[PDB]
Coordinates of C-alpha atoms and ligand atoms in Angstrom, one line a residue:
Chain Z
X12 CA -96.1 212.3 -61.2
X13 CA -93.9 213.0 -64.4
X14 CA -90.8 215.1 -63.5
X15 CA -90.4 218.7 -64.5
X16 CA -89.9 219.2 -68.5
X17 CA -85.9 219.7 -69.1
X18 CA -85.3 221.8 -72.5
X19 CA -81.9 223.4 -73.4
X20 CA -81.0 226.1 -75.8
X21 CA -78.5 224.9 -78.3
X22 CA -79.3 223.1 -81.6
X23 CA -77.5 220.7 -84.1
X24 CA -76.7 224.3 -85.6
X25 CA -74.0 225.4 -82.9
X26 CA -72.4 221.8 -84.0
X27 CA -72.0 223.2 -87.3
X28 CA -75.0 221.2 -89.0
X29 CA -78.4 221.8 -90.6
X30 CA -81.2 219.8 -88.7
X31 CA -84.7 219.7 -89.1
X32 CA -87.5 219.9 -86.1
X33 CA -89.9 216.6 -86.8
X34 CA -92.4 215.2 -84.9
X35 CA -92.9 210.9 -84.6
X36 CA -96.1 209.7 -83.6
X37 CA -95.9 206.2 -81.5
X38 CA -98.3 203.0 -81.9
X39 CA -100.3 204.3 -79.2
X40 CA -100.3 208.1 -80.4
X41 CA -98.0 209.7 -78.5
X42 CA -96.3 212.7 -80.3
X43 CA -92.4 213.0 -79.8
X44 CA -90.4 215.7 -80.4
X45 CA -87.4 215.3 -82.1
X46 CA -84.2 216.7 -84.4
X47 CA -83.1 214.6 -87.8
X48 CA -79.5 214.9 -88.8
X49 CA -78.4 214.1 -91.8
X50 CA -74.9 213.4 -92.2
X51 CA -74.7 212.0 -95.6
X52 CA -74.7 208.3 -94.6
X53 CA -76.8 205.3 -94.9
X54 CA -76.3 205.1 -91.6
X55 CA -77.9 206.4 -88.3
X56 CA -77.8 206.4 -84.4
X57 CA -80.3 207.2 -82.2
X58 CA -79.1 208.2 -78.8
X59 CA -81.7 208.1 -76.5
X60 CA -81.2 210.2 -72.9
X61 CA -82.2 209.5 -69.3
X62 CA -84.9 210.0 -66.7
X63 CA -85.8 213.7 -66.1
X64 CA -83.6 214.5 -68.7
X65 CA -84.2 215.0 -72.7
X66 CA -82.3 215.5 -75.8
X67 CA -80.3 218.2 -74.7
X68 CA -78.5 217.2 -72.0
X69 CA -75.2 219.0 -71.3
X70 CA -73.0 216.6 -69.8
X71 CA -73.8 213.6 -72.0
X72 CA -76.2 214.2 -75.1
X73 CA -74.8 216.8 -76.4
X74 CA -71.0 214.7 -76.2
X75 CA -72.8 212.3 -77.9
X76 CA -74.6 214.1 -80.5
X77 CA -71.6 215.5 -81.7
X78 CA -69.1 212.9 -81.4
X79 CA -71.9 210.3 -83.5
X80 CA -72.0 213.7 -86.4
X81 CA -68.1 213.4 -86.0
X82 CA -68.4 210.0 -86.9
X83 CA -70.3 210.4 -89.8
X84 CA -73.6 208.7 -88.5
X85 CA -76.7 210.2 -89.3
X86 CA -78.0 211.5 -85.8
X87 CA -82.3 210.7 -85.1
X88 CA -82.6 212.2 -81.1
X89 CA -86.1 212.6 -79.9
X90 CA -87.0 213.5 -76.5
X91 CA -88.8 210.1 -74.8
X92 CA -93.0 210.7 -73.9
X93 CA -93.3 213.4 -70.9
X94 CA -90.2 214.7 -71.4
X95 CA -88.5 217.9 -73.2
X96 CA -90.6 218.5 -76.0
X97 CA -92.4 215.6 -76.2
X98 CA -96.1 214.4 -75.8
X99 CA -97.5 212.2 -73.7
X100 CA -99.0 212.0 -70.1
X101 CA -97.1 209.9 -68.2
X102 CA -93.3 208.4 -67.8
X103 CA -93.1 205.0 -67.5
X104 CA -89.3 205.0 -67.4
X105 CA -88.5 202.1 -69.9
X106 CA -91.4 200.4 -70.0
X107 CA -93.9 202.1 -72.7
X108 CA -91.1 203.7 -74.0
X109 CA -89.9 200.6 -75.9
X110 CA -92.9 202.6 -78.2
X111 CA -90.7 205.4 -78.5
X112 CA -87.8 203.7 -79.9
X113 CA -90.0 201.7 -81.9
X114 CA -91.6 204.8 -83.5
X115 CA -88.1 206.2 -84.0
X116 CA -87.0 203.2 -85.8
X117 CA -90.2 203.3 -88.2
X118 CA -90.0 207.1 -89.2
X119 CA -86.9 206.4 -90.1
X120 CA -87.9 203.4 -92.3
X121 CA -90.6 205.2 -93.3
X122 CA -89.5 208.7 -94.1
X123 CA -85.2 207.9 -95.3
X124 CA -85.1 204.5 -95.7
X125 CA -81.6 205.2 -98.3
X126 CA -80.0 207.2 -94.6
X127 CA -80.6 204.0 -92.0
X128 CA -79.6 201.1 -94.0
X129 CA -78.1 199.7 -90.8
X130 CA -79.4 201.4 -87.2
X131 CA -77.6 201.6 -84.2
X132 CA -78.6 202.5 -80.9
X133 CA -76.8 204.5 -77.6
X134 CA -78.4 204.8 -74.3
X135 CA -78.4 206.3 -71.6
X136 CA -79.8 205.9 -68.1
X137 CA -83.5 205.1 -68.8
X138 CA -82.5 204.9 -72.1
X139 CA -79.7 202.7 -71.7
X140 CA -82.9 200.0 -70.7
X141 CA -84.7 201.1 -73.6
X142 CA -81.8 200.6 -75.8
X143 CA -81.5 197.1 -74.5
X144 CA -85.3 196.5 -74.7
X145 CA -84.9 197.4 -78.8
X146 CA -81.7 195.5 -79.6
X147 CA -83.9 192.4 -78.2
X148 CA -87.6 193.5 -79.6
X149 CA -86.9 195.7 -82.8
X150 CA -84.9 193.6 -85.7
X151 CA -84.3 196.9 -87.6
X152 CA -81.4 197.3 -84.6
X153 CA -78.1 196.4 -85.5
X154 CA -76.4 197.0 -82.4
X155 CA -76.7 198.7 -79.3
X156 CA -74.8 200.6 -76.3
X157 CA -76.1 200.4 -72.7
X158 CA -74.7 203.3 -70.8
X159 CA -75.6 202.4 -67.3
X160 CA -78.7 200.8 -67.8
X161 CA -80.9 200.4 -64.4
X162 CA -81.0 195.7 -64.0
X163 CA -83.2 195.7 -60.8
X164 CA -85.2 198.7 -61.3
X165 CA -86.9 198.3 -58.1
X166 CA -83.8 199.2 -55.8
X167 CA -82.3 201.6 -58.8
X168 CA -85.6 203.6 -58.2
X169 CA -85.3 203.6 -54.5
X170 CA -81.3 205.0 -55.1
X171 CA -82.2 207.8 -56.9
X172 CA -86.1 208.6 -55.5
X173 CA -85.2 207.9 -51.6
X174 CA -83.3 210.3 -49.3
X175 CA -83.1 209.1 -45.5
X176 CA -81.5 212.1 -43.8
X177 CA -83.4 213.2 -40.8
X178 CA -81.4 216.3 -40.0
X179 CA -82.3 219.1 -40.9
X180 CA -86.2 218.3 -40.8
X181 CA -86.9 221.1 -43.6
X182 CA -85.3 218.8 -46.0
X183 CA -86.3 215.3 -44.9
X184 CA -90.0 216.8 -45.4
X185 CA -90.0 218.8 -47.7
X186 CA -88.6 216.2 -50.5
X187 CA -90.5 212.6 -48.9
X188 CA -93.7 213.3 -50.7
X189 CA -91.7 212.9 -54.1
X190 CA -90.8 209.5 -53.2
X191 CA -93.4 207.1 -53.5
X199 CA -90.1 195.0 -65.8
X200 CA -87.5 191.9 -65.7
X201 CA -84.1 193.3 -67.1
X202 CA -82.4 190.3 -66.8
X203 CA -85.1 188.2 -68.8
X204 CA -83.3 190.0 -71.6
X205 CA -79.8 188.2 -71.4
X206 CA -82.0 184.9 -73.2
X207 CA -83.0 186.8 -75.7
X208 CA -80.3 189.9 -76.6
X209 CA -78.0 188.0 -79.3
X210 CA -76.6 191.4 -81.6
X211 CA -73.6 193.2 -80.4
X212 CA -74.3 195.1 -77.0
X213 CA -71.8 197.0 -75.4
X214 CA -72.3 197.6 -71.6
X215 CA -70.9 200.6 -69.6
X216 CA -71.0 201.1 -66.0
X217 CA -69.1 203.1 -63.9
X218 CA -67.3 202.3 -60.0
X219 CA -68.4 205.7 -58.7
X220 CA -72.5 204.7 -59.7
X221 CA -74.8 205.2 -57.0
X222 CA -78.0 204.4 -59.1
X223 CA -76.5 201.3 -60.5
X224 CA -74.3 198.9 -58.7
X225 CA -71.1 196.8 -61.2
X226 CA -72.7 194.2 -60.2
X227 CA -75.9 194.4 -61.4
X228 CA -74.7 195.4 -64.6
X229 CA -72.0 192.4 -64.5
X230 CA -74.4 190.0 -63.7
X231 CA -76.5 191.3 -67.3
X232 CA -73.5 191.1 -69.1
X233 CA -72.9 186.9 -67.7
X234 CA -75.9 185.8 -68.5
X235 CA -76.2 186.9 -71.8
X236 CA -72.4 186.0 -72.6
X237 CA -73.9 182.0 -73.0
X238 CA -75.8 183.4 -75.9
X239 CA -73.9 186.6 -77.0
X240 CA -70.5 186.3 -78.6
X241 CA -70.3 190.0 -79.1
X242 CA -71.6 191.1 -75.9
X243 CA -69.0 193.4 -74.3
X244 CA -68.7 194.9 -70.8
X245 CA -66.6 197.9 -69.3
X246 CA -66.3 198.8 -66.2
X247 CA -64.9 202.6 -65.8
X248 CA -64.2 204.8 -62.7
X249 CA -67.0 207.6 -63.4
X250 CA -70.4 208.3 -61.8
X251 CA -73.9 207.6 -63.3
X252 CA -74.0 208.0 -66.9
X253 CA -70.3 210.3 -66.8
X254 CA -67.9 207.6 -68.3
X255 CA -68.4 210.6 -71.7
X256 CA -68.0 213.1 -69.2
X257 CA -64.6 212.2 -67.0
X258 CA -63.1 209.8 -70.0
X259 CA -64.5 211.9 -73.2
X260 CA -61.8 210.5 -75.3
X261 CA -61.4 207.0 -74.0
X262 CA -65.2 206.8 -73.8
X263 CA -65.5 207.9 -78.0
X264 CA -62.0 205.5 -78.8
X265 CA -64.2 202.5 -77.5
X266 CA -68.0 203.2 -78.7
X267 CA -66.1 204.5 -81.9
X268 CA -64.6 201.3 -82.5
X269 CA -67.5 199.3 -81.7
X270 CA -70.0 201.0 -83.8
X271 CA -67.2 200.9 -86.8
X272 CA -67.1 197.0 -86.1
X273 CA -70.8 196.4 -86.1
X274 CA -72.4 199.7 -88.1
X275 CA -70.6 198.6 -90.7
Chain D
X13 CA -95.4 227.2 -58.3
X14 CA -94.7 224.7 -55.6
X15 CA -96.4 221.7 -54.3
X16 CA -99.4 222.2 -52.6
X17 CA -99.4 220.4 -49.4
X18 CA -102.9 220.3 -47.8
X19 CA -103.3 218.4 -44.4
X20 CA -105.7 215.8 -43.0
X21 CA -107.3 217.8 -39.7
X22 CA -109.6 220.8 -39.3
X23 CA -110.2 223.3 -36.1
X24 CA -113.0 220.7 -35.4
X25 CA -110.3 218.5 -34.4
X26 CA -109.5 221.0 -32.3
X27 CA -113.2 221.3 -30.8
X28 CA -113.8 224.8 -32.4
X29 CA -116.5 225.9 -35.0
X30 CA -115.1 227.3 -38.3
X31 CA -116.3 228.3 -41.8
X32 CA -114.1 227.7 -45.3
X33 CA -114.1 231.0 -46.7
X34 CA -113.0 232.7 -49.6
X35 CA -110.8 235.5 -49.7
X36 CA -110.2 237.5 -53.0
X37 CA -106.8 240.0 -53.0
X38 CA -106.2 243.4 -54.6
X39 CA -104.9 241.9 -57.7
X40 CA -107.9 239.5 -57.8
X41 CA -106.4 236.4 -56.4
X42 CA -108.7 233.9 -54.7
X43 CA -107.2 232.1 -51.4
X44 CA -108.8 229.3 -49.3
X45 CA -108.9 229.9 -45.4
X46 CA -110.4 229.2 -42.3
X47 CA -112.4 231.8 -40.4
X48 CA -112.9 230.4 -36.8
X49 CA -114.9 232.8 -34.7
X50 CA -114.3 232.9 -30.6
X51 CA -116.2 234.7 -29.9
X52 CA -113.4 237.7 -29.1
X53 CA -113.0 241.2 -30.3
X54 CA -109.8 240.1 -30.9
X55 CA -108.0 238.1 -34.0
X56 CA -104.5 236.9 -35.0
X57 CA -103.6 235.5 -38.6
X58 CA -101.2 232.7 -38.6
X59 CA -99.0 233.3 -42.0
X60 CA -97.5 229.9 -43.1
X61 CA -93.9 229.0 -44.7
X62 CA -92.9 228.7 -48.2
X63 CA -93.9 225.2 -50.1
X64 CA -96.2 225.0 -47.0
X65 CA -99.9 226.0 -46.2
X66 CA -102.2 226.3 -42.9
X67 CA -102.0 222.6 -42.1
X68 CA -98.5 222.0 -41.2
X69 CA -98.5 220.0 -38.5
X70 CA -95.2 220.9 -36.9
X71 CA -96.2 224.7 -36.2
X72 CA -99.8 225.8 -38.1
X73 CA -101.6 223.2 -36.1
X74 CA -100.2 223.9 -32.5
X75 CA -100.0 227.8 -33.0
X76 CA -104.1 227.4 -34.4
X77 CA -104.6 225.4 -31.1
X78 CA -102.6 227.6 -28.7
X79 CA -104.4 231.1 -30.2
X80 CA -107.9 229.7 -29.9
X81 CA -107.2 228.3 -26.1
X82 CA -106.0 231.9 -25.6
X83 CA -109.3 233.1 -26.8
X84 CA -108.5 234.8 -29.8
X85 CA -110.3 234.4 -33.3
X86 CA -108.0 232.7 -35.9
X87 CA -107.6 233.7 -39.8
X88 CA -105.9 231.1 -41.3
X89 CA -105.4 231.0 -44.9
X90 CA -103.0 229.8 -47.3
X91 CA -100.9 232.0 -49.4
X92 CA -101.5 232.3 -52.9
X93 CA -100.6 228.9 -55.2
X94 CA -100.2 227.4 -51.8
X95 CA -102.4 224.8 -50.4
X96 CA -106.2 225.0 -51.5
X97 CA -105.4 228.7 -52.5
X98 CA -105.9 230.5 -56.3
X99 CA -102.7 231.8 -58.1
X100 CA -100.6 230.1 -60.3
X101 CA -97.4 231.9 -59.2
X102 CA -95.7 232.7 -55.8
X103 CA -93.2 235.0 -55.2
X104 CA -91.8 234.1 -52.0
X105 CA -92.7 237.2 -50.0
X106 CA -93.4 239.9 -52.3
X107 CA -96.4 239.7 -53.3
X108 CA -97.4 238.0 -50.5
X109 CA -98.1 241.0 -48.8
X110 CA -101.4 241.4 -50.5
X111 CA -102.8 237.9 -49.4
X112 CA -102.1 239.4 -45.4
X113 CA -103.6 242.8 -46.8
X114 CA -106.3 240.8 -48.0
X115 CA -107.2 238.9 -45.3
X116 CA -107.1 242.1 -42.8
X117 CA -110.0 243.8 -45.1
X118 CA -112.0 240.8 -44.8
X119 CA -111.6 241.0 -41.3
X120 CA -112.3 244.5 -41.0
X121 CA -115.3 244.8 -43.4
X122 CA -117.2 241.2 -42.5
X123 CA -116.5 241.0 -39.0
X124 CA -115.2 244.3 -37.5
X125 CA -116.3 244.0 -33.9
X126 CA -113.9 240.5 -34.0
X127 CA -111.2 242.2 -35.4
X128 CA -110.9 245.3 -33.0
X129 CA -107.6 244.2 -32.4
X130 CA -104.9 242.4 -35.2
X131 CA -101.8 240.6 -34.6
X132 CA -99.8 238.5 -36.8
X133 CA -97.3 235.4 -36.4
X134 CA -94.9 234.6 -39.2
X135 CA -93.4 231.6 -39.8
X136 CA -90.1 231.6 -42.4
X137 CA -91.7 233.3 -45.8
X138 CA -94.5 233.7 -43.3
X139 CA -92.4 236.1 -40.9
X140 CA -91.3 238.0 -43.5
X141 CA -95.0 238.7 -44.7
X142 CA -95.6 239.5 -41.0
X143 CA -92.5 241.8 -40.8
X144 CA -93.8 243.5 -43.9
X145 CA -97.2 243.9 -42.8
X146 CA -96.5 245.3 -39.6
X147 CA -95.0 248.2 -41.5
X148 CA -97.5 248.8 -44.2
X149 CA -100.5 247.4 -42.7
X150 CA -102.2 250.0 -39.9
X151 CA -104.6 247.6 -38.8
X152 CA -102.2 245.1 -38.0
X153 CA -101.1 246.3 -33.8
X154 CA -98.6 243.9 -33.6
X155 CA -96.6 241.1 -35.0
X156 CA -94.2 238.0 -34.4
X157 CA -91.8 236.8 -36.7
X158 CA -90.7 233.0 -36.0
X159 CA -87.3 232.8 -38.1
X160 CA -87.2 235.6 -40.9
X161 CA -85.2 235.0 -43.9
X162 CA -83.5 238.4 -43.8
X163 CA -80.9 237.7 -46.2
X164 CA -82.8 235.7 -49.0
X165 CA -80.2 235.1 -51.5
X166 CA -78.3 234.1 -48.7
X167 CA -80.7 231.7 -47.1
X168 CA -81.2 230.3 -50.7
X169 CA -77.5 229.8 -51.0
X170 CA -77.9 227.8 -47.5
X171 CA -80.9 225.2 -48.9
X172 CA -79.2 224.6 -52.1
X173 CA -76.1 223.4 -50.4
X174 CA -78.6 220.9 -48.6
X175 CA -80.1 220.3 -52.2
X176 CA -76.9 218.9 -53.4
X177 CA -76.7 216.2 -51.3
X178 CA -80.0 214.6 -52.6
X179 CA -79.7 212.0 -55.4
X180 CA -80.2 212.4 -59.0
X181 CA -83.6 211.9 -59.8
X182 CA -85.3 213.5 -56.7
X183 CA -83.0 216.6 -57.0
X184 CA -84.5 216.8 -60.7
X185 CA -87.8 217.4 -59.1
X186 CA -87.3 219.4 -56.3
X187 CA -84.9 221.9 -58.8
X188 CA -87.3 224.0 -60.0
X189 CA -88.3 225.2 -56.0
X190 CA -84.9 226.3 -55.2
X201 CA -85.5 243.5 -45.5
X202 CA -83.3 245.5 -43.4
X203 CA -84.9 248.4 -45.1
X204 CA -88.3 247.4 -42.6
X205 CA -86.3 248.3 -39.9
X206 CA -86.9 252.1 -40.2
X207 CA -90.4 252.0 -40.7
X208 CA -91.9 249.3 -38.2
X209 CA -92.3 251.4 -34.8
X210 CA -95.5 248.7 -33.8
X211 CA -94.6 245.9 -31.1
X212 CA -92.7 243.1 -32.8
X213 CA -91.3 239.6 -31.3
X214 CA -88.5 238.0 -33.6
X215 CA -87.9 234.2 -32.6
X216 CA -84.7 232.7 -34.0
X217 CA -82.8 229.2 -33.1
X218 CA -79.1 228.9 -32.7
X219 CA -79.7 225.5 -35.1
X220 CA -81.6 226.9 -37.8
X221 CA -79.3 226.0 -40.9
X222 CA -81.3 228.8 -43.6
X223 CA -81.0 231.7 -41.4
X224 CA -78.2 232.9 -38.6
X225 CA -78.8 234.2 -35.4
X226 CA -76.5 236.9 -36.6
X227 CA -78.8 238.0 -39.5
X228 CA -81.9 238.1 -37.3
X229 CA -80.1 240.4 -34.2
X230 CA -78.8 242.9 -37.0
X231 CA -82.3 243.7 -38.1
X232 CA -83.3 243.9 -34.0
X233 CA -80.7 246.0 -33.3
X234 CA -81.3 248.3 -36.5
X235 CA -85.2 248.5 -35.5
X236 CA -85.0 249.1 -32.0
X237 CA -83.2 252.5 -33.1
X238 CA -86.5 253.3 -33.8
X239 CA -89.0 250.9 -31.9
X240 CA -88.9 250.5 -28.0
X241 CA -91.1 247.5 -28.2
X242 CA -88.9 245.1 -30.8
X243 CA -88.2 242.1 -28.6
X244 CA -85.5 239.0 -29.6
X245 CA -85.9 235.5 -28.5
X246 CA -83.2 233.1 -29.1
X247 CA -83.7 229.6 -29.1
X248 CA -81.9 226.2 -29.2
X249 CA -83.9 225.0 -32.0
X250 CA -83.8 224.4 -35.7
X251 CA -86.1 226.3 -38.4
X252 CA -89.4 227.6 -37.9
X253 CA -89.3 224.6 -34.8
X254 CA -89.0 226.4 -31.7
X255 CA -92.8 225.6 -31.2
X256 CA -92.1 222.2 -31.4
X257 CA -89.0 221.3 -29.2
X258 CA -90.3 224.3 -26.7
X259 CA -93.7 224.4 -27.1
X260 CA -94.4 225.1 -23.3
X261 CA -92.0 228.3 -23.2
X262 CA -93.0 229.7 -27.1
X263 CA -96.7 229.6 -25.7
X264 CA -95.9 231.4 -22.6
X265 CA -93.7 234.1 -24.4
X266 CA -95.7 234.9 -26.9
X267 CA -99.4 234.5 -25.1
X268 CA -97.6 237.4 -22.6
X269 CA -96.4 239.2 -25.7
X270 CA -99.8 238.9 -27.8
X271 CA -101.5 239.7 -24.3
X272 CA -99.9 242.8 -23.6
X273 CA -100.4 244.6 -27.0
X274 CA -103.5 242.9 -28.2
X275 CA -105.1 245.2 -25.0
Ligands
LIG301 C1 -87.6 224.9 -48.2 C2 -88.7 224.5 -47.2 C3 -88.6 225.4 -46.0 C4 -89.8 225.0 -45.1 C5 -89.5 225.1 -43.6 C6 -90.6 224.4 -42.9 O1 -90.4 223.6 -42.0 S1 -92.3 225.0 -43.3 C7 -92.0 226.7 -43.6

């Protein structure tokens, strides 16, 4: 069961750019919806958003939309399969949707090959896994950030899916029916720059999980970076706005190039 | 356009012989029911909640039981885009109104001398439909309302409160699924039910539009209970039989 289709109503235009509606098809022919940017750079980020949500997401896609254009980056955002816009039957929140990045990554390649010299990636939730998944699996990735990514999906599902209040019964009922990949293998394999967020106040995704990523990969990654901040699930951009651009500013300056 | 929720049991689980029929409304919409004939002059129509349908176990199934061990016939149906129903669209109680109108013309025109008499019980979205029907449907001698939204926007306000404390994700699905003017026309026998725990609708909402009816009708009745939503059936089910069995009994003839 794929969750309801988010869509928003503003557009790169109310950030004071021109943009252009394109559609990327995926190795296995999925058909994502998606805005190109162009900024004037040889350079892009593609900031991919979470489960349930899509492109336009008001409390952190659109922060970081604008904040990348501030930047200077060229901006690729698509919405991933079965979400927003996008084709595609079924969610397999960040599993098939490694195909998604990867199809983002070759249309750019493909279609401006002179605007993503270098490639960088931010993500968020769901994305922040797929984010992680690319910087390991797709070499046209420079770097990546990993905006509380989900480690043990298993108990990250049962977090967000599960509700065990009894009282009242309307609730408990109505909302059970709704609730029915190794992350950490990646911490061998991850050796660009990857810069982890994950806040104290996270009910989806412990510190811990998220500290124990950023450990293991350490033995193999010099310029693996952790920070642990105060906000809730994928808000770090939201309560720290300024704090949150200062440090993902600076680290896509360092390795963007 | 909620989730249809369609149960696992049948009246012949209950021991009583039934057909799946097909009822089409005024505004051609095709809902799924259950006509169960016993063999009475006499039939009541169960009216299910919102996001709910003619199976739910906690109320549908014991009030189906109770009615037929009274003796009455039972239409059961489910309301439009609920359950095994047609529609694509509900509208929480408006148009609603035309499923129960619906279901009382198929009564009356395929099996009239089982439908001499025509009570309704309501439960939540249910008892408003009930409410409504006992004002514009003649047919209809009699109705009880289990738990009546009768401020809506209110009682919305109340279930998104309990929304908010659901995480993230499941919140993202469930999103999209978050009458005093009746009491001037409804001069037909009427038994409102509400509990002293129900957390959508106040005791205090439900004993306004009794004591605004009974200006006009000498046969509104209020029952107040010490139970939550649409559950009085459940934690009472001894005394809601009893109450309302005397009440249908009485005005049924
Ligand atoms: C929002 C769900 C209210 C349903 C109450 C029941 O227990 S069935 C009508």
């Amino acid at each position: 069961v794929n969750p309801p289709r988010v869509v928003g109503n503003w557009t790169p235009k109310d950030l004071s750019f021109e943009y252009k509606d394109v559609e990327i098809t995926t190795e296995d022919n999925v058909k994502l919806s998606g805005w190109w940017i162009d900024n004037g750079s040889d350079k892009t980020v593609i900031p991919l958003h979470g489960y349930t949500s899509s492109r336009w997401a008001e409390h952190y896609m659109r922060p970081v939309i604008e904040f990348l254009l501030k930047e200077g980056y060229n901006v690729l955002a698509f919405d991933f399969r079965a979400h927003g816009k996008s084709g595609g039957k079924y969610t397999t929140v960040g599993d098939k949707e490694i195909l998604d990045l990867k199809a983002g990554v070759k249309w750019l390649k493909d279609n401006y090959p002179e605007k993503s010299k270098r490639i960088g990636v931010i993500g968020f939730s769901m994305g922040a896994l797929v984010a992680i998944r690319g910087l390991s699996e797709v070499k046209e990735i420079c770097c990546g950030v990993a905006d509380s990514p989900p480690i043990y999906l298993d108990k990250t599902g049962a977090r967000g899916m599960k509700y065990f209040a009894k009282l009242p019964e309307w609730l408990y009922s109505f909302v059970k029916p709704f609730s029915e990949i190794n992350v950490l293998n990646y911490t061998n394999s991850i050796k660009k720059p990857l810069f982890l967020i994950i806040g104290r106040r996270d009910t989806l995704v412990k510190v811990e999980e998220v500290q124990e990523f950023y450990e293991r990969n350490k033995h193999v990654n010099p310029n693996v970076e952790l920070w642990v901040t105060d906000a809730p699930h994928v808000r770090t951009i939201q309560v720290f706005p300024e704090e949150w651009k200062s440090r993902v500013g600076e680290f896509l300056k360092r390795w963007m190039g």
